[PDB]
Amino acid sequence: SVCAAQNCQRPCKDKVDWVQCDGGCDEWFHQVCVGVSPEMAENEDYICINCA
Amino acid sequence: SVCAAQNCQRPCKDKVDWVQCDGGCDEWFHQVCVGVSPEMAENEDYICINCA
């Protein structure tokens, strides 16, 4: 179920989205933990704070 | 399981956190959808974008 937010990300869904760093560590991050939207995660590269 | 993030919020957990607006609409929001941490949600008031 969606919440009152205009852009509800449905944290209640049965799927967890991930994104991998391109900066060099090559590690996997939960998208919500690093504050990226599925759009961001797919349309551009991702550089974690340790590789930044 | 935790991801590579230093502060993993475990979106994989079996619980969903919510926060209610104090601005007037009195509506409920999923905390991740509005970008608030459990700490923020508990230690101060919450005013949604529509009530801001």
Partner: peptide, 8 residues
């Protein structure tokens, strides 16, 4: 970036 989805 490289992405993936897992369960729940």
């Amino acid at each position: 970036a490289r992405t993936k989805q897992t369960a729940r």
